[PDB]
Amino acid sequence: TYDREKEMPLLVVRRLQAMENYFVDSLQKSHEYHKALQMRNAQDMQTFQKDVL
Amino acid sequence: NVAALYEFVDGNFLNNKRPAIPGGAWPLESLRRKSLADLQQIWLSLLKERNMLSTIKEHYLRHQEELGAMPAPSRLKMVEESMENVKRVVKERDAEATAEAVRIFKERLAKGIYRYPPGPPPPPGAHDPTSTVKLVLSRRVDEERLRELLGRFNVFEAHKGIVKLTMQLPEDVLTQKRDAEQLW
Amino acid sequence: FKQGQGMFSHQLKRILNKKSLHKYNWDPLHMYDPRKLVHANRYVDHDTYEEKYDPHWEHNAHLVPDQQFYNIPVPKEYKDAYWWRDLQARRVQCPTEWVHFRMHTKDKLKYDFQDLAFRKKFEYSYEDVVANAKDMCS
Amino acid sequence: VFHNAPSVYPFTKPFHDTPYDQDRGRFDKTKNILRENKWPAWMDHGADGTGFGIGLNRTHPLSKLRGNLRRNPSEIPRVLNMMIQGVWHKSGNKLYFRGGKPPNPSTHPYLTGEPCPVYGWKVTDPGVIREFNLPQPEDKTRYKPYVALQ
Amino acid sequence: SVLSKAVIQLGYFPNITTTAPRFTKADDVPRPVHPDEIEGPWEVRVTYDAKDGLAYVQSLSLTSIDGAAVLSVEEEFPAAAQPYAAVDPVYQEAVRREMAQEETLMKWPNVPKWKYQYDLYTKKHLAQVVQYNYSNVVDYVDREVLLTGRSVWESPIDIDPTCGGMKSVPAHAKKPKRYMTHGLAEVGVTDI
Amino acid sequence: WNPIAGKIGLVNRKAEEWGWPHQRPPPTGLRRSPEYFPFFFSRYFPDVEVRLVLDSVLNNETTRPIFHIPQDMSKQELVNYLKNIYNIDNVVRIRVRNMRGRRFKNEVGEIKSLPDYKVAVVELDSPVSIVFKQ
Amino acid sequence: HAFMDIAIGSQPPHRVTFELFTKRCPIASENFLKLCTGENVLPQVSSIDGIGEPSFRDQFLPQLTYRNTTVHRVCKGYLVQGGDIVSGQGTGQLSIYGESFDAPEEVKASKFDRMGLLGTAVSAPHLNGSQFFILTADKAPHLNGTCICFGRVVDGWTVVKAIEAIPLTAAGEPAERVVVVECGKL
Amino acid sequence: GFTMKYKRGTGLWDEDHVNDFDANKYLSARSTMRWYYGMERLQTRNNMNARR
Amino acid sequence: VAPWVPPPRHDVKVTMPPPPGGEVGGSYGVSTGYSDRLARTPYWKRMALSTYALRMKENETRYPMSPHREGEYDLRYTVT
Amino acid sequence: EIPEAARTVMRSHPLQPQLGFVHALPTDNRDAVVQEWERMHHLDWQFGKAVYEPRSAENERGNLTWLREVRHHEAREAFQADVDSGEARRRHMAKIKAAAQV
Secondary structure (H helix, E strand, O other), rough: OOOOHHHHHHHHHHHHHHHHHHHHHHHHHHHHHHHHHHHHOOOHHHHHHHHHO | OOOOHHHOHHHHHHHHOOOOOOOEOOHHHHHHHHHHHHHHHHHHHHHHHHHHHHHHHHHHHHHHHOOOOOOOOOOOHHHHHHHHHHHHHHHHHHHHHHHHHHHHHHHOOOEEEEOOOOOOOOOOOOOOOEEEEEEEEEEOOOOHHHHHOOOOOOOOOOOOEEEEEEEEOOOOHHHHHHHHHHHH | OOOOOOOOHOOOOOOOOOOOOOOOOEEEEEEEEHHHHOOOOOOOOOOOOOOOOOOHHOOOOEEEEOOOEEEEEEHHHHHHHHHOOOHHHHOOOOOOOOOOHHHHHHHHHEEEHHHHHEEEEOOOHHHHHOOOOOOOOO | OOOOOOOOOOOOOOOOOOOOOOOOOOOOOOOOOOOOOOOOOOOOOOOOOOOOOOOOOOOOOOOOOOOOOOOOOOOOHHHHHOOOOOOOOOOOOOOOOOOOOOOOOHOOOOOOOOOOOOOEEEOOOOOOOOOOOOOOOOOOOOOOOEEEEO | OOOOOOOOOOOOOOOOOOOOOOOOOHHOOOOOHHHOOOOOOEEHHHHHOOOOOOHOOOOOOOOOOOOOOOEEEEEEEOOOOOOOOHHHHHHHHHHHHHHHHHHHHOOOOOOOOOOHHHHHHHHOOOHHHHOOOOHHHHHHHHHHHHHOOOOOOOOOOOOOOOOOHHHOOOOOOOOOOOOOOOOOOOOOOOOO | OOOOOOOOHHHHHHHHHOOOOOOOOOHHHHOOOOOOHHHHHHHOOOOOOOEOOOOOOOOOEEEEEEEEEEEOOOOOHHHHHHHOOOOOOOOEEEEOEOOOOOEEEOOOOEEEEOOOOEEEEEOOOOOEEOOOOO | EOOEEEOOOOOOOEEEEEEEOOOOOOHHHHHHHHHHHOOOOOOOOHHHHHOOOOOOOOOOOOOOOOOOOEOOOOOOOOEEEEEEOOOOOOOOOOOOEEOOOOOOOHHHOOOOOOOOOOOOOEEOOOOOOOOEEEEOOOOOOOOOOOOOOOEOOOOHHHHHHHHOOOOOOOOOOOOEEEEEEEEEEO | OOOOOOOOOOOOOOOOOOOOOOOOOOOOOOHHHHHHHHHHHHHHHHHHHHOO | OOOOOOOOOOOOOOOOOOOOOOOOOOOOOOOOOOHHHHHHHHHHHHHHOOHHHHHHHHHOOOOOOOOOOOOOOOOOOOOO | OOOOHHHHHHHHHHOOOOOOHHOOOOOOOOOHHHHHHHHOOOOOOOOOOOOOOOOOOOOOHHHHHHHHHHHHHHHHHHHHHHHHHHHHHHHHHHHHOOOOOO
């Protein structure tokens, strides 16, 4: 009764969904750490441009 | 139920029959034939026996004298050894099920279709402001001798505008050199 | 009148000889966070106010290793503050009393010993020692 | 090796005696500060007077819940003192280990949730309580435990 | 005995003759093309920090680099479809973080492949090997067959020659191939 | 129980979880997931031995049949177990001990102590019984 | 069809009419109606039984409507992304179907080749929420199998091309707050 | 230390200039096959060691 | 545990080992450098990527001095 | 707020700012009390610390790192003079004609 052409594409969904949902859980932990800096580089050419004038 | 506890205990031991030996554990080539939806239906039956044999053998254990050893004690060997068969058949499917998932997801990595602050990433060729030339030379010339010549002439930096020059040999040569090193 | 001659003092003198797990947790660079240097020397573009993609940066970048990160990239100028971690990642990851087999015998030669990385050098197999010494007809 | 401190010979050697100090080592005593412990407070001292929550709470990997069954070298000295000594609560009743057969923290069922005062437990995560959910094949295609012969 | 299986021709050192080579003199041997005499086309890949590479590098109109005689100035275009995930630190740090966890798993419990204490762990005496795996089963079957008479081959109580030591020696352990062993098992002798 | 973690026990864990020296690891996301095979071989193919003692459920009627369940089956799981596997639907109170597995000296002489278990005296509503015709 | 009014800070609303591809992609498109049509309402007060017995208290919880949302990520020359019911910063996804949803037929069969198209915003294909994005750069080949193209803006393109021209402040956000005043159906 | 290493192969046979105190009066049938095979081994065991 | 053991310091030359550490900036105490990139690539490979005019530029023996630590004697030829 | 007419100046202007250095600064993050107990006195400029207040203008006298580049700049305006006139292209086209006949 095994139907590999139908049940493996059921499983691969479950493994792949299990990774993508973690890779973006890791993309959090780096974005919550970094976007605190990218603005500190933005807030430091907002003021450079200011100081040129 | 009242009679539900009867499937804990063997029918022959209740019925004083000389119990019958098993037929045989599940063969592997006939296991992978079975889908996963029922591989557990044929699992609980292994389960509801390994309980139904253990509760008998601890009963024969409790009265070693009145009853002696457990009759047909190889049954329980042919249920555990049949459990491992189901254990290594799912482990086969959950190998390729995993390996095909890793082959996809690991080509979405380099595809870059993920991005945490949910959205479509910036276009592919926007960030790179780089141009690469495959200059092909007959003999090798030294690297820094190239960086001095083919490098830019307008930019006042030691990098001379050229990000990275790399000599390479075509694999048709890395063998055309490989054998002519052997035939030599 | 001591106390506790019983069995718990008969196990706790035998099970505690079991060697716990060792993981060479190398020192954490608290004050010099290395991963917050991916943003050093980045032309902020005056449209998106983010770092422009410098193609040169990655060449003046010195990948300082890590345990929870493969290889953190830092610009070249800030490379020397991480002088200990580049000496701890190249190290061998066990107290060298366990790998003293390599340091006193004639493995002193057959091994890379640069900053205590007791890793084997290259070594031909015996199918090759004769493949390389018969082809010469030596 | 007492002087593994920031070398400052003519100035004051900050912290010198105070709790947060250098030149005292890492795996030292005098680290009551570091009272911060991942394990919830209630399981190292009971949720109430009777020392209810006291014990060693193994936890399931998936379960976000944190239990105090550590096996780090710095934490086994207290995880044995739970299994062999047991706890004598200041209320008069002996806790987690009170009799003969010392518990096996690694064969405990997993910590299912923090205790509450009103009920017993807020079952914070049910994904740790296994609910064996195998369908019973009473519809069709009967499956004995083992197969027939040729 | 593989002493006798040897076939002797001259009896002394060059036991089996060495046939003659092809050519009379050495200078009659065909010389090949030495691998340094090849000088195959060295493809050097230059990458600028500008979009005007191909049109510039041809402005020079290279014809030699003192040995080169440049053969072709084609453009690689390896920026094709480069995902922003190649320059984004927020992304590349997610992947390079992933590499570690899947790499410390491979190397962290660094337990040697083999060491001569293993064949001291996995091996035991006969006195203990049985103690670790014994039942009365082994002598019920001795009473069993003597009467009932069912000729059995395998072992009723399954043997454990490691005496439980496999949970002190990693499962991926294997004696390395021993070279030039000091035995007579390879020289299978049948008469001495 | 020895709390101290041994090095080998982790290595012996990997080689069966995934072919350790040969097959590269599954990405840490999958390992933190209920789709990791040993979390998948558990959520769908449990491995438990809820053996029933008969000395309390024999010809003498009983409202409190006694079981043995592995040391790591809590109460509310023994409910879920009998409910969904043995159709038992009337369990108001379960009463759980923990017993040191039986010990003895085999005829050779090594102290061969069986594994430990967990007596769980369930208390069904309407009493159950077993008949034995001689 | 459906509309949406865009308020660029101190400037008036402006109708953006979306022609939802309700035919080819039902789920993600019907996810848009229910989110725009203001279909999920739960008004409650604590005094009168709001707190005591029901224990619903899910109205102190992401509300599942585009009302009063924002337009946060605006990539000039590329697109204008917006609409989130969970986090003001553009993160997190909400939907009719819980946290998110993946539709296998609806993700592979997507092609972003028209301007003004309207797609979903994903952290990954398995994740689709309220977050949509209106494509302003004409072609999008790198967006083929990533997300779903459940419709296109049918008119009122003036704003999605006037939103795009709004400057980015330091924060990578538009200098002036683009607010989605009131949505509905057409 | 210094152990006349310039004499290892410079003998006329294989059993010479190899200090082997472990001898016996009567080396038997297979103790002689073990011996002759032994001298050459630690003569080729040494060489390919020193070649690798 | 070392994921991504770093590469040797000054491995930039195609057919000779990288100069020893310390001389490049690293830990002293070892004389002979070695880089597993170089020792693994078979000989013909190392002879492919290089022409004779080049090896004579990286064979180059700066005998007492050190080519890198300008002014100090090469630390693979000192007593230690 | 910046204008537009001046904005296009700082864009097309050759010399642009690197502008990421603030992060290289060393962190002193710990309990605020244990961090500030140490500054019980002027432990501020002491032992390789520095109260980094963001500076917008620099003293030009004796400032090595300032003269170290104002010459490097005046060595960039001088090299830039060639590319203006075209003696760079010549002196660069003289290499390839030195490196062709050989």
